[PDB]
């Protein structure tokens, strides 16, 4: 069968993290979403000419269940570490998220992508250069996305699949 990539979305709650995966799955012209069905987290895509299936785990809203992340992180092949560009605490939380992923995977080289999400018209507090520097210090890619326009969404997920393929 075609390759199935199991992806995990990690990040602070309260800052629109869920828009990343919702926007990917729903067509750029459809807006009626049901998270109760299998098609809402599974998507067949073609990346660099190679067809594959993305299985995306986003537990958005379960951030208080802080002792359940390791179970989710161990199965995951690749991670999207998401923060909101209008929320510095969400940017600062990334370090512990990456650390937990390394601890669970028992590796310093885990397929990972840092994602800066523009979740609303409120003022930007995290500048792209700060995020690019953070990403370079971890040795991972940085991608900014817009929750409103779908810009950067496909690049965030595709960049991660390329990170897994080159692992």
């Amino acid at each position: 069968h075609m390759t199935e990539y199991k992806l995990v979305v990690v990040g602070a709650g309260g800052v629109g993290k869920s828009a990343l995966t919702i926007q990917l799955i729903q067509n750029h012209f459809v807006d009626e979403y049901d998270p109760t069905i299998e098609d809402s987290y599974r998507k067949q895509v073609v990346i660099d000419g190679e067809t594959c299936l993305l299985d995306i785990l986003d537990t958005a809203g379960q951030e208080e269940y802080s002792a359940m992340r390791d179970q989710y992180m161990r199965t995951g092949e690749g991670f999207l570490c998401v923060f909101a560009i209008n929320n510095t605490k969400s940017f600062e939380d990334i370090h512990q998220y990456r650390e937990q992923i390394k601890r669970v995977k028992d590796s310093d080289d885990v397929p990972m992508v840092l994602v800066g999400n523009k979740c609303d018209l409120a003022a930007r507090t995290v500048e792209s250069r700060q995020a690019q520097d953070l990403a370079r210090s971890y040795g991972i890619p940085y991608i900014e996305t817009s929750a409103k326009t779908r810009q950067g969404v496909e690049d965030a997920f595709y960049t991660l699949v390329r990170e897994i393929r080159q692992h």
Partner: protein
Amino acid sequence: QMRLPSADVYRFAEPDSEENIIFEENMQPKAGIPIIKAGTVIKLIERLTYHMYADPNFVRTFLTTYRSFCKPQELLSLIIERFEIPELKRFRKEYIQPVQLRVLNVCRHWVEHHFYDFERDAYLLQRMEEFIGTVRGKAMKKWVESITKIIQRKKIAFQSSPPTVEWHISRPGHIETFDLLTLHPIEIARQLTLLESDLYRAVQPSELVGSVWTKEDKEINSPNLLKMIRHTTNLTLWFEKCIVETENLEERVAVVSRIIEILQVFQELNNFNGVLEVVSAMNSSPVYRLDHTFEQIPSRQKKILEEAHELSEDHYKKYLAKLRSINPPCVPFFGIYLTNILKTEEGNPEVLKRHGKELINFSKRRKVAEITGEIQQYQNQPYCLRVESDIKRFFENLNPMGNSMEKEFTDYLFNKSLEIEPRNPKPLPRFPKKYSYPLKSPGVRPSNP
């Protein structure tokens, strides 16, 4: 067809159109009534108090979810306006009398199931009592007296014998000695199921609608949900702590094994929250890696643990099928509902536009009310188990983290794991025993009829 007033004098008389109201292709399954997809607030208010028929499903949904698109104060104004209605004999009996009674049914349902709106805004209740006073008629006297009686009640806020409380090393009243291995594994599981069952039952829809447990005021708006998530996290951390602080391998195998017994009783009781607290502790970074410990665990317990783990796998596919196949009493895992509510609210637009006119997306709200209804269906049935006040207080007061912060404590558990079972190739050290009492389990079979 009846003759209704002009929109200039009565906004609710404006006729239906694609610019003010839209419907789903299907009908209410048990009622044959159309399902509203979207409409203007005036049109949603019209259909909430419709003259042709009563729509209890819409009333229930609307009152649970309206606060995103209409303030309580605005809703009361709209329903007062709807009641104040400006051939004449049939209009009084087929439009005015039904509508005025449906407005009072809405008032009655609001004060009964969503009194928090009145508790939070004393002026809202001032206006409800004022409006309810101005209602005159023999047809309404019965419904006006019911509303008043519900208000005053709200303002001044069953089986056979349960099984015998199980005891192991600690005897009744000896709280000082209570611990994971000294209390009976059946009783740990029963008392935790009782605590978790009451924590689950206390979560109200007002803590969920609008995803308010994720917002800055989550501590004000979702206190019961947060106490339930915190208990759960605490029990998982306590299980991990019990394991990794048992440095002696034989004693640690006894600890892991006793926890897998507690899980078995959680499974028998349909306490899925408890099952997942155990699975979460077993799959944590400090515990997962204890290969020398799990090697000594009986195959029966590995198999019990392995099947409990599988409930979580593949987006809770097996868990969901299992929860759907059982009937109360049970304690569901709340996290799935939280993700589903959040994603429904963030993945669907607040408004639909038709011919350049904004319509409140009511379907999005219905979907949320369907999730909140599924939570409530498991909140009615209690467990036929007796409370043991001391074991209850023991679990309510568990504080594994002490004064440490999350990172500091979690780093400590992991460093303890590395000390008791170092990474290969480092050999396995030996550690002295810490338990003066016997490590043999009494088992999970109830020791009494």
